[PDB]
Design a protein around this ligand. Structure first.
Ligand SMILES: [N-]=[N+]=NCCCN(CC[C@H](N)C(=O)O)C[C@H]1O[C@@H](n2cnc3c(N)ncnc32)[C@H](O)[C@@H]1O
Ligand SMILES: [N-]=[N+]=NCCCN(CC[C@H](N)C(=O)O)C[C@H]1O[C@@H](n2cnc3c(N)ncnc32)[C@H](O)[C@@H]1O
Ligand SMILES: [N-]=[N+]=NCCCN(CC[C@H](N)C(=O)O)C[C@H]1O[C@@H](n2cnc3c(N)ncnc32)[C@H](O)[C@@H]1O
Ligand SMILES: [N-]=[N+]=NCCCN(CC[C@H](N)C(=O)O)C[C@H]1O[C@@H](n2cnc3c(N)ncnc32)[C@H](O)[C@@H]1O
Ligand code: NA
Lengths: 343, 343, 343, 343
C-alpha cells in the first residue's frame, strides 16, 4: 500500500497504538476550539452535507461523523486504522445511526469504499501542520472524491515568523553544559558537550509565547487540499523574506498554522496563532544555532525546507541571512522528537 | 536471537531510540542517589574488581564501566545496543582508558565476547523493578560468567503494601467520567463509560507519596540474580498476606524495590522506598476500580501476577481479598503505559 | 374538599404532625430574618391593617396574627389545621387579644368564616418556594377576600442560576459508587449502579454556597399571588436562557426565591438569595448527572418543569443545553427527598 | 392480615417508603459491625445452612440471603415488602442464584410460602431493639418454621442502666426557656413554656456517650426468639433494681441491646453497647422528669413498661425510686419520635 511504502512498520505500530487510547481521543475532543470549530464549520454549512455522501478520514471516536450526521448527511463512511474503530462502532450503535454511519476499520490507503463521496472530512493536522504526515492520507483519500467534491478543511496555511527569546536560547546551553565538567564522579564528560548542544538544538520547541517576541510580520505558505497531490508533501520548500519591525537578535523561527473550511454558506477558520486562544497544537519554535542580529528595516531572507522521512515526520532545514550584513545561520531539526516545554 | 524472539521489533526500535539521546543519559546520571550509590558499591568493593575482567550490560554513556575502571578492573567489556555506544567510545578515548574499556556495540544476546568474565554489572531495573524486561538480558549475560563469578546488583527485593488515597482514586475517576456524558456536542458517549474506566484504571501511577497512606507493613518478594534463570521472569507470581494496621478503604497497592550489591568487603543497598531519598524511579501505585474496606486486624490476601509480553513489559493482574469478609478486588494493569503524576 | 383530593392522607398526617411540635415553631420563630422581616412588613404598612378584617392562613404559633394585632387590625381569623391551633389560642388569651384574634381550627379549604376579609397573610413558602404546596392553600383562601383586598406576601420571585461545584458533584457520585462494587462481602452489586446514581442525583441539595460558583446572571420567574389561581401551580414551566459569564463545567442549577410585601406605605422584600443573610430556607441546588461544558459568551437554554404531586411536593424536570454545541442534559429530581448538607 | 390490624396505614406507607431507598439500605450495609457479624454468624455456622431451606424475613437488598447461599443453603425464600424487592431480584439474577434464592415481594404476614423451613434469618432490630415492631414479623414468621428449626438471631437482650448527664438534662430547659420571655417581638410566649418542656422530655435521645456517665451495672431483659410468641412483644415489662456503683444524681435510663446467634458450631454476639464500636443504632437515653439522688451502694428500683402502639413503635413508661430514701421519679416517652442528638 502507499502507506506501508512511506512508513516504517515500527513507527506505524506506535502511531496507531497511541490513537487507540480513549484518553488521547478525549484529549483531542476536550480541545474546545478544535471540536467546536469543526462542529460550526459543518453545521453552519449544512447545505454541503444534507443528503450527501461523506467520507471521514481517520474518524477516531467518530465525533466528526456525528457532526456530519447532525448536519443531515445521507451516508458517512468513517475510516479508522487504530483499535479506536471498535469504539466508534459502539457509539454509532448506541446513537442509533447504523443506517447512516458505516465504520470501516483499516488504513484509508488499503480499505475499499463501495461508492464515491461528495465531501471528505478529516482532522489531519499535527504540529507545524505537517507532523504525522496524515495530510498525505487525507489527500490520498481524494481518489474516492467526485469531481464535484469538497474537502473540510479546504486549505491550510503555515505561518513562519522570526522571534527573539534570549532565555529560551540560553536554556539550551545551560542544559548541555552538564557535559562540560572534567570530573563527574571522576569522569571527564566534556568531549560530549558538542554532541549534547547539537541534540538540544535539533528539537523543535512546542509551547506558546507572548506575541511581543515576534520581530516581523509572518510569512504564509498555503496548501490547497483540493488541488494538492500526495507527492507535493514529500518535499516542502518555504522561501521567506522578513522585513524586520524591531531591532535585535533573532534566535529562530516560530511556526503556527490556520485551516479554512470553505463551504457554500460561509468560510470558517481554525487558527493556532499566538494571537488566538490556545489549542493542543500550541505553537512551534525552531532555534538557530547562531542568532542573527537585525536592525529594524533590515531584510531577513532564506528558506525553510521540510523533507518527509519514514518515521511519519519531517527533517527541517532552515537557512537564513541578513541581506544588509551577509550574516548567515543554519539549522537542522527533527520534528519527530520535539521538546514539550509548556508547563 | 533470544532478544528478537521475545520482542516486537516496533518495541525494540522505539526502546533503543529512547536511550540513544544524551538528554536521557543526563537525566539518569543526574539521579545522584543512583549514580552515587553505584559508585559507592563498586569502589568500596574494589577488591571484587581489581585486575578482574568485567562485563557491563547496557553501559549507555559508560559511567559504570568508568567506575569499574576506577576500581582497578583489568578489562571491561561494555555492551550497548543503542547509538549511545558511539558516545561511550568518545568518552573512553578522551578519558584515556582505551587499554581497559572496550565498547562492544550490539545486544548482549547477539554479540560475541572474547573471554568469560569475573563479574557482571548493569542497571536493569525499570519501574516496579521488572519493566523494560532488561533483567532478562542481565540474566542472559550469565553465559559469559565464570562459575565463581559475581553480579552487581546481586539481589532485588520487590516491596508491596496496601494504601488509602481518595484524592488519587477520584482524580482518575474524574478523568474517566468524561465518557459518561449523554450529550457531548449532541453525541451520547455513555456506552463507552465502562471501557474508559477500565483503561484509566489500567495505568500504574508513578510518583511519590507520604508513608502515612500505607495501611500495613510491606511484603517482600526477592529475586536472586546469581541463581535465577531467564525463563523465571516470563511469569512472576507474588503472593501477599497483609495484616491491616489501620481501618479504612484500601484503594490499591504500592510498589517499590531495593537492590543489593553483595561484595566481598561490604553489602551496599540501593532503595526506592518512600522512606528513602527520592530517585528517578519514584514509587508505583496500582489502583483498584473498587476500593476494599478493611478493619484493623483483618487480613488482606492475594496475588500480584506479572506476565511478560512482547512489548518489553508485563501485563499485571492483581487480585486481593479481605479474608474475613470475602470482599474481593481483581485488577488488570498495563505496566507499559504509566501515569506520571509528578509535577 | 380541595385539599384531600390533591393530597394523600399519609402525607397530610405526617405533614400536620410535623408542624404540631413546639420545637418546630420555635425553630421557625428563631429565623430572625424571617420573623423580623414579616414584622417589619406588617408594622411599616400598619395602615393596611388598621381597623381591617384579616385572614391568617396557617397561623401556627400565631405570630403573624399578633403582628397584625399590633398594627391595629380590628379582627384576625387565624386558621390552623395542626394541633398547634390549641397552643395559639393559649397565647391569644395570655396576651389578652381574644377580642381581636380568633383561632379557627381546621384546613383553610374546609372551614367556614363569618365574613369576607380585607387582607390575607401567610408564610406559605417552602424549599425552592413551592415545596409543601401551601401556596395553593394561600391562593385558595382568596375565596374569602374582598374584591380589592390585599395579600402579604403579594408576589414571589424564583431565581435560577447555573453553578460549578466539582466537590459536590463528586461527593454525590462517591456516595453512588458504593453500588459499583463487584464483590461487597462476596456479592456483586454493580447491576444496581444505574439505579443508585439516579436515586442520589434525584435529591435537591439544600445548603448555602459562595456566589462565586455562579456562572451567569440569574433568571427570574414571578408569581403574582393577587392574580394567580390554584390551578396555575399544578404545572409550573420555567424557561431559561443564560448568557454564560465564565467558561467551565456547569454542574447544575441553583434556586432561591424572593417574596415582596407590597403595602400602601412601602414595599418590603424577604430574600433567600446567597448574597443575603442566611435563612432557614438556605438555597437549593439541583445537580446534573453529567456536567455541561460551556465557554463565556455561550448561551445555556432550557426549561425547569415543576409538576405538583399528591405528596405535597413537586416532581422536578430540568432540561438544559448549550445552544452553540447542542450539549444537553436532562434530569429528574424529587423535591420531597432533599439532601440536607450542613456543618 | 396481622400486620394491617396492628398498624395504622399512614405509618406503614412512610415506613416502607423509607426502606425503598438504596441509600438507606446502603446506610445499613455500610455498618461493618452489623453486616460483618451477620456474615460471620452465618458462615462460621455453615452446618446450620448447608443444604437447608431458609427463610429471610425482610431481606431488603438481599445481603443475608447471599450469606445464606455462601454457606451452602439449598433454597432461600427472601420476603420483602418495600420496593427494594425489585432491586433484590436484580441482584439475585446478576449473581446467578435464581435457582437458589426466590424473592417474594410483600409482607411476611400476607404472602404465602410453599414449605416449612429449617431456619429463619432476619435483622429486625430497631432502636432499643423493639422500635419499628419488626420483631413481631420475625416471630410471626415462625408459622413457617419446622419444630426443630433455628432462628438467627436466636435471642435478644435489652440492657438498661442509670446515667448522670447534667448537660443533657439542662439542655432541655435551655431550649424550652425560649418560650419564657414577655416580649418576643412584642408577644408574651411564657404561657407555653410548660408545654414545651413536656414535649422535650417525651423524646428519647438517640446518640452515643462516654461510659463514665453510667452509674450501675446494666440490667438485662432477654427475649428468646425460639420460644417467644408474637403477643409477648405487645407489652414488655422490664423490672429493674440497680445497685449504684457511684454516688450522684441519676437523670435517667440508658438503653442498648445485644443479639446472639446460637448455631451448631458456635455462638456469635452482636452488641450495640457503649463499650463496643459504634453502630448505626447508637444508644438511647430516656430522661426522668426529676433527677434522683443516689448514694453508692443504694438501690434504684422500679419498672420500665413498653406498650406497643399502632405507629409501629412504643410508648415508654419509666418509674424509679431510691429504696433507701423513698425519692421517686417517673417519665412517659414516645419512641416513634426520637431526638437525634449525635454530633
Ligand atoms: N495533534 N493532533 N491531532 C491529530 C488528529 C488525530 N485523529 C483525529 C481523531 C478524530 N477525527 C477527531 O477529530 O476526534 C486522527 C485519527 O486518524 C487515524 N488515522 C491516521 N492515519 C490514518 C490512516 N492512514 N487511515 C485510517 N486512519 C488513520 C488515527 O488513528 C487517528 O485516530
Ligand atoms: N528507568 N530506568 N533505568 C533503566 C536502565 C537504563 N539503561 C542503563 C544505562 C546505563 N547503565 C547508564 O546509566 O549509563 C539501560 C541501557 O541498557 C541498554 N540496553 C538495554 N537492553 C540491552 C541489551 N539487550 N543489550 C545491550 N544493551 C541493552 C539500553 O540501550 C540502555 O542504554
Ligand atoms: N420550609 N418552611 N416554612 C413554612 C412554614 C409554614 N407554616 C407557617 C407557620 C406560621 N406562619 C408561623 O410562622 O407561626 C405553615 C403552618 O400552616 C399550617 N398549614 C399548612 N397548610 C394548611 C392548610 N391547608 N390549612 C390550615 N393550615 C395549614 C401548618 O400546619 C403550619 O403550622
Ligand atoms: N439496620 N436496621 N433496621 C432494621 C432492619 C432494616 N431492614 C433490614 C434489611 C436487610 N435485611 C439487611 O440486613 O440489609 C429490614 C427490612 O425488612 C423489611 N420489612 C420490615 N417489615 C417487613 C414485613 N412485615 N414483611 C416483609 N418485609 C418487612 C423492610 O422493608 C426492610 O427492608
Ligand atoms: Na533479601
Amino acid at each position: 500500500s502507499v502507506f506501508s511504502e512511506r512508513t516504517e512498520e515500527s513507527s506505524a505500530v506506535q502511531y496507531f497504538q497511541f490513537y487507540g487510547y480513549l484518553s488521547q481521543q478525549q484529549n483531542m475532543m476536550q480541545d474546545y476550539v478544535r471540536t467546536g470549530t469543526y462542529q460550526r464549520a459543518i453545521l453552519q454549512n449544512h447545505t454541503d452535507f444534507k443528503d450527501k455522501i461523506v467520507l471521514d478520514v481517520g474518524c477516531g471516536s467518530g465525533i466528526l461523523s456525528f457532526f456530519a450526521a447532525q448536519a443531515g448527511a445521507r451516508k458517512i463512511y468513517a475510516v479508522e486504522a487504530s483499535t479506536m474503530a471498535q469504539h466508534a462502532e459502539v457509539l454509532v450503535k448506541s446513537n442509533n445511526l447504523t443506517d447512516r454511519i458505516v465504520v470501516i476499520p483499516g488504513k484509508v490507503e488499503e480499505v475499499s469504499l463501495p461508492e464515491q463521496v461528495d465531501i471528505i472530512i478529516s482532522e489531519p493536522m499535527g504540529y507545524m501542520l505537517f507532523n504525522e504526515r496524515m495530510l498525505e492520507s487525507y489527500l490520498h483519500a481524494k481518489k474516492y472524491l467526485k469531481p464535484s467534491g469538497n474537502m473540510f478543511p479546504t486549505i491550510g496555511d503555515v505561518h513562519l515568523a522570526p522571534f527573539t527569546d534570549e532565555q529560551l536560547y540560553m536554556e539550551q546551553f545551560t542544559k548541555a553544559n552538564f557535559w562540560y565538567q572534567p570530573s563527574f564522579h571522576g569522569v571527564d564528560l566534556s568531549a560530549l558537550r558538542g554532541a549534547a548542544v547539537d541534540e538540544y538544538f535539533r528539537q523543535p520547541v512546542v509551547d506558546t509565547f507572548d506575541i511581543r517576541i515576534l520581530m516581523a510580520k509572518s510569512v504564509k505558505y498555503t496548501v490547497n487540499f483540493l488541488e494538492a497531490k500526495e507527492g507535493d508533501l514529500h518535499r516542502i520548500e518555504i522561501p521567506f523574506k522578513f522585513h524586520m519591525l524591531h531591532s535585535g537578535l533573532v534566535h529562530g523561527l516560530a511556526f503556527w498554522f490556520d485551516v479554512a473550511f470553505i463551504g457554500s454558506i460561509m468560510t470558517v477558520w481554525l487558527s493556532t496563532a499566538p494571537t488566538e486562544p490556545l489549542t493542543h497544537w500550541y505553537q512551534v519554535r525552531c532555534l538557530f544555532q547562531s542568532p542573527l542580529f537585525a536592525k529594524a528595516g533590515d531584510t531577513l531572507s532564506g528558506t525553510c525546507l521540510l523533507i518527509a522521512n519514514k518515521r511519519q515526520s519531517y527533517d527541517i532545514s532552515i537557512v537564513a541571512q541578513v541581506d544588509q550584513t551577509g550574516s548567515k545561520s543554519s539549522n537542522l531539526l527533527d520534528l519527530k522528537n520535539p521538546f514539550f516545554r509548556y508547563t
